[PDB]
Amino acid sequence: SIDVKYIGVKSAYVSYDVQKRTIYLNITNTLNITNNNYYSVEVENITAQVQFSKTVIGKARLNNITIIGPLDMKQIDYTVPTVIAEEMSYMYDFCTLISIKVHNIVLMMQVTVTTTYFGHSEQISQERYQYVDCG
Amino acid sequence: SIDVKYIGVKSAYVSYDVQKRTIYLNITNTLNITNNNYYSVEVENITAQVQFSKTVIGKARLNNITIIGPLDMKQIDYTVPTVIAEEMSYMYDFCTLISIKVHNIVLMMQVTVTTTYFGHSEQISQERYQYVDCG
Amino acid sequence: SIDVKYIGVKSAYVSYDVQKRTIYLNITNTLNITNNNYYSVEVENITAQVQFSKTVIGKARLNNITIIGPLDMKQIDYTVPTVIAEEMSYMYDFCTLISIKVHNIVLMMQVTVTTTYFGHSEQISQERYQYVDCG
Ligand SMILES: *[C@@H]1O[C@H](CO)[C@@H](O)[C@H](O)[C@H]1NC(C)=O
Ligand SMILES: *[C@@H]1O[C@H](CO)[C@@H](O)[C@H](O)[C@H]1NC(C)=O
Ligand SMILES: *[C@@H]1O[C@H](CO)[C@@H](O)[C@H](O)[C@H]1NC(C)=O
Ligand SMILES: *[C@@H]1O[C@H](CO)[C@@H](O)[C@H](O)[C@H]1NC(C)=O
Ligand SMILES: *[C@@H]1O[C@H](CO)[C@@H](O)[C@H](O)[C@H]1NC(C)=O
Ligand SMILES: *[C@@H]1O[C@H](CO)[C@@H](O)[C@H](O)[C@H]1NC(C)=O
Ligand SMILES: *[C@@H]1O[C@H](CO)[C@@H](O)[C@H](O)[C@H]1NC(C)=O
Ligand SMILES: *[C@@H]1O[C@H](CO)[C@@H](O)[C@H](O)[C@H]1NC(C)=O
Ligand SMILES: *[C@@H]1O[C@H](CO)[C@@H](O)[C@H](O)[C@H]1NC(C)=O
Ligand SMILES: *[C@@H]1O[C@H](CO)[C@@H](O)[C@H](O)[C@H]1NC(C)=O
Ligand SMILES: *[C@@H]1O[C@H](CO)[C@@H](O)[C@H](O)[C@H]1NC(C)=O
Ligand SMILES: *[C@@H]1O[C@H](CO)[C@@H](O)[C@H](O)[C@H]1NC(C)=O
């Protein structure tokens, strides 16, 4: 990347800011901005690129061959019983949460068994998380 | 990427801002902005690219060959009983949540077994998460 | 990367800021800004790149061959019982949370068994986490 910006409230290249309950009198603002931006990004000069894959099997005997890729999720149990018995009782459940396997962002590239790759891979995440807000 | 911006409230290249309950008197604002932007992004000069895949099998004996790709999700159990028994009781369930496997964003590229890839892969995520808000 | 910025509230290249309950009188602001930015990023000059993979099997005997990739998640149990018995009782559950395997951001590149890779891999994360807020 080049420029990544996270700003909580206010972003301003030039800010003449006046807030509340203010007396703004006899003001002379003079501004000159000569701003130049020149970007040359991701320039490639390749005369020749070779990607080569060769597989040869000759009068061979192969048996019981197994190949398994990544993220092999097998025999997984989630068990969340909730047994609530009541007798002459007062429950005030204002904000009660039961969350299981709650994803927000899942991003995947190039999850393989055999990969031959040339170039650029980029991931950017910006956010504001706020799970529970009980006023 | 080049320019990624996250701004909570206000973005302004030039901001002459006046808020409430303000007296703005005798003001002379003079502004000159000579802004130039030049972008040259992702320029490629290839004289020759070869991607080559060759497979040869000759008088061979192959048996019990197994290939499995990624993300192999097998024999998975989710069990969330909720047994609520009641007897002379008062329940006030204002905001009660039971969430299982709640995704927001799932993004996938190039999830394969064999991949030969040239170029650019880019993922950008911007958001504001707010799961529960109970006033 | 080049420029990564995290700002809590306010970002300003030039800020003439006046807050509340202020008397702003007899002001002469004069500003000249000659700003130049020149970026040359990720320039490659390759005359020749070779990526080569060759596999040869000749009159061989192979048996019981097993290859397993990364992230092999097997035989995993989550057990979170919640047994709440009640008798002449008052419960005030204002903000009670039961969270299991709660992800926010999961990012993956190039999770393979065999990888041949040339170039750039970049990951950027910016956020503000706030799990529980009980006023
Ligand atoms: C504002 O400027 C003018 C001219 O410069 C001047 O006559 C005036 O008195 C100023 N304001 C005050 C409140 O003095
Ligand atoms: C910018 O503006 C001011 C305002 O008077 C001027 O004096 C100056 O010569 C200007 N410069 C450029 C580079 O534009
Ligand atoms: C890429 O193109 C030619 C190839 O040799 C080279 O002379 C030139 O300087 C390169 N371009 C840049 C912007 O560097
Ligand atoms: C391996 O081969 C034997 C017999 O040759 C067979 O019983 C077994 O199931 C095989 N295992 C796999 C994983 O293929
Ligand atoms: C505003 O400016 C004019 C001319 O510069 C001036 O006559 C006037 O008095 C100023 N305002 C005040 C409130 O003084
Ligand atoms: C910008 O505007 C000001 C206003 O008077 C002027 O003096 C200056 O010469 C200008 N410059 C350019 C580069 O436009
Ligand atoms: C790509 O085109 C030619 C090929 O050699 C090269 O001379 C030129 O400089 C390159 N373009 C840029 C913008 O670099
Ligand atoms: C492997 O081969 C044996 C017999 O040769 C067979 O019983 C078994 O099911 C095979 N396993 C697989 C995974 O193909
Ligand atoms: C503001 O400036 C003007 C001219 O410079 C002047 O006459 C005036 O008295 C100033 N304001 C005050 C409150 O003195
Ligand atoms: C910037 O502006 C001031 C304002 O008078 C001027 O004196 C100066 O010559 C300017 N310089 C450039 C480089 O623009
Ligand atoms: C890449 O292109 C040619 C190749 O030799 C080289 O002379 C040139 O200086 C390079 N470009 C840059 C911007 O360095
Ligand atoms: C290995 O081979 C034996 C018999 O040759 C078989 O019983 C066993 O299941 C095989 N194991 C695997 C992992 O393939």
Identify the DSSP state of A113: S
The position carrying tokens 């009198």 is A25
Closest-CA residue, ligand 10 atom 1, reads: C32
Alpha-carbon distance of B60 to A35, in angstroms, equals 69
Closest-CA residue, ligand 5 atom 11, reads: B26
Q: Which atom of ligand 3 is nearest to the CA of A45?
A: 1
CB A11 within 8 A of CB B3: no
Which ligand is closest to the CA of B26, given by its number?
5
CB A26 within 8 A of CB B27: no
Burial of C37 (0-12, 13-18, 19+ CB in 10 A): exposed
> What pairing do the DSSP bridges indicate for beta strands B82-84 and C132-134?
unpaired
Six-digit token string for C134: 């009980």
Element (H, E) at A76: strand A72-79
Q: Select from C19, C22, C53 the Cβ nearest to the Cβ of A53.
A: C53
Report how far Cα C17 is from the mean position of its chain's Cα atoms.
34
CB atoms within 10 A of CB C120: 14
3-state secondary structure chain B: CCEEEEECCEEEEEEEEECCCCEEEEEEEEEEEEEEEEEEEEEEEECCEEEEEEEEEECCEECCCEEECCCEEEEEEEECCEEECCCCCEEEEEEEEEEECCCCEEEEECCCCEEEEEEEEEEEEECCCCCEEEC
CB atoms within 10 A of CB B106: 12
Give the experimental resolution in Å: 3.2
Query: Residue A123's closest CA among B128, B121, B109?
Result: B121
B6/C126 CB distance under 8 A: yes
Ligand 9 lined by C27 (C-beta under 6 Å): no
CB C104 within 8 A of CB B103: no
Query: Residue A44's closest CA among A120, A121, A123?
Result: A120
Determine the residue of chain A that is closest to B134 in CA distance: A134
Alpha-carbon distance of B82 to A80, in angstroms, equals 9
CB B134 within 8 A of CB C97: no
Cα of first residue to Cα of last residue in chain C, in angstroms, is 39
Identify the DSSP state of A70: S
A100/C101 CB distance under 8 A: yes
Alpha-carbon distance of C85 to C37, in angstroms, equals 68
CA atoms within 13 A on the CB side of B12: 17
Six-digit token string for A67: 């190949």
| CA distances for C43 relative to A2, B1, B41, C78, C119, angstroms | 14, 15, 11, 50, 11
Q: What share of chain C is helix, strand, coil (3-state, %, to 5)?
A: 0, 70, 30
Identify the DSSP state of A87: S
Q: What share of chain A is helix, strand, coil (3-state, %, to 5)?
A: 0, 70, 30
Six-digit token string for C57: 């099997």
Beta sheet of A49-58, edge-to-edge order: B49-58, A49-58, C49-58
Ligand 10 lined by C35 (C-beta under 6 Å): no
Q: Which atom of ligand 4 is nearest to the CA of A64?
A: 14
Phi, psi for A5 (deg, rounded to 5):
-125, 130
Element (H, E) at A19: none
The position carrying tokens 């993300």 is B71
CA atoms within 13 A on the CB side of B7: 15
The position carrying tokens 């997984």 is A76
Question: Helix, strand or coil for residue C111?
Answer: coil
Question: Helix, strand or coil for residue A63?
Answer: coil
Alpha-carbon distance of C92 to B90, in angstroms, equals 12
Element (H, E) at A103: none
The minimum CA-CA distance between B4 and chain C, rounded to whole Å, is 10
Alpha-carbon distance of A86 to A93, in angstroms, equals 14
Alpha-carbon distance of A50 to C48, in angstroms, equals 8
Contacts with B40 (C-beta within 8 Å, 6 or more apart), sequence order: A39, A40, A41, A43
Cα of first residue to Cα of last residue in chain A, in angstroms, is 39
Contacts with B41 (C-beta within 8 Å, 6 or more apart), sequence order: A39, A41, A42, B2
Given CB atoms, is C80 within the 8 Å cutoff of chain B? Answer: no
Alpha-carbon distance of A50 to C116, in angstroms, equals 12
Alpha-carbon distance of C125 to A124, in angstroms, equals 6
On chain C, the residues whose CB falls within 8 A of the CB of A107 are: 106-108
Cα of first residue to Cα of last residue in chain B, in angstroms, is 39
Determine the residue of chain C that is closest to B100 in CA distance: C100
CB C94 within 8 A of CB A93: no
Lining ligand 5 with CB less than 6 A are: B 25-26
Query: Residue B57's closest CA among A115, C56, C67, C114?
Result: C56
CB B45 within 8 A of CB C45: no
Query: Residue A20's closest CA among B9, C15, C18?
Result: C18
Angle at C99 between CA C96 and CA C105, to 5 degrees: 130
**Å from CA of C28 to ligand 10 middle:** 16
Question: Helix, strand or coil for residue C47?
Answer: coil
Question: Helix, strand or coil for residue C134?
Answer: strand
Report CA dihedral (A7, A11, A17, A18) to the nearest 10 degrees: -30
Alpha-carbon distance of C30 to B29, in angstroms, equals 10
Identify the DSSP state of C21: S
Six-digit token string for A126: 């910006």
